[PDB]
Design a protein around this ligand. Sequence first.
Ligand SMILES: CCCCCCCCCCC(CCCCCCCCCC)(CO[C@H]1O[C@@H](CO)[C@H](O[C@@H]2O[C@@H](CO)[C@H](O)[C@@H](O)[C@@H]2O)[C@@H](O)[C@@H]1O)CO[C@H]1O[C@@H](CO)[C@H](O[C@@H]2O[C@@H](CO)[C@H](O)[C@@H](O)[C@@H]2O)[C@@H](O)[C@H]1O
Ligand SMILES: CCCCCCCCCCCCCCCCCCCC(=O)O[C@H](COC(=O)CCCCCCCCCCCCCC)COP(=O)(O)OCCN
Lengths: 75, 88
Amino acid sequence: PISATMVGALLGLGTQMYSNALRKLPYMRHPWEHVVGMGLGAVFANQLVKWDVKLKEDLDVMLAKARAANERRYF
Amino acid sequence: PKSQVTPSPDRVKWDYRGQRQIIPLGQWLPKVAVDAYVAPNVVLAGQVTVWDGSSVWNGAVLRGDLNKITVGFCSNVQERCVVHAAWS
Ligand SMILES: CCCCCCCCCCC(CCCCCCCCCC)(CO[C@H]1O[C@@H](CO)[C@H](O[C@@H]2O[C@@H](CO)[C@H](O)[C@@H](O)[C@@H]2O)[C@@H](O)[C@@H]1O)CO[C@H]1O[C@@H](CO)[C@H](O[C@@H]2O[C@@H](CO)[C@H](O)[C@@H](O)[C@@H]2O)[C@@H](O)[C@H]1O
Ligand SMILES: CCCCCCCCCCCCCCCCCCCC(=O)O[C@H](COC(=O)CCCCCCCCCCCCCC)COP(=O)(O)OCCN
């Protein structure tokens, strides 16, 4: 399927070549920073997914606390 | 009438560096855009500006020593073209 690693690598390569294009340079000007960008994009995508899971868990906990606080109004 | 010349013993008969393509004249440095193609045989002297998409081809000399020389967007100066500027 579409994993976070591959979408991150594609986004990193795309942003590196987009930066190269924006400066009127050839797309593959410096090949090493393309690899660096692919690695950074993969890392960022994986960290984003890992953070999203924890963020949803914390939101669920906070909403459970809020619902429990509201429910006590009926006593 | 003289008919007399004095050869210099320090004159160089072969420059291993070849001819330098960009020749700055004092504070005038030729400006070449990163998107512009300038052939390795080209000589740019003085204040010469080459813009985006422009191209200068083999054997061309662009001496902007006297006045300014400007090559526009996507405009090309082809092979062995001498572009020079006068005071007035
Ligand atoms: C802008 C580009 C648009 C691309 C998106 C469309 C393409 C679809 C792929 C989107 C994609 C990557 C996100 C890309 C980030 C963008 C890059 C950011 C900039 C980078 C430069 C996330 O997509 C999935 O992520 C899930 C979150 O886990 C979510 O499911 C919801 O979760 C619940 C919440 O708790 C909800 O309650 C519930 O309703 C849903 O179940 C959904 O978002 C979705 O199913 C692909 O999934 C990737 O993440 C996980 C799978 O999870 C995989 O690894 C996981 O790791 C552990 C979990 O940490 C797990 O332990 C492990 O078992 C698992 O293997 C990866 O291998 C890969 O598959
Ligand atoms: C988010 C949607 C997904 C987007 C895709 C994300 C993908 C992950 C990121 C991929 C990045 C790929 C980049 C390839 C690596 C190239 C880095 C080389 C930079 C470098 O060598 O350092 C000097 C400049 O520093 C720099 O260029 C550093 C620039 C950093 C700018 C931002 C700094 C962090 C700010 C915080 C984030 C931005 C705000 C967010 C709210 C270069 O020097 P030189 O040779 O070019 O010449 C002098 C120019 N100065």
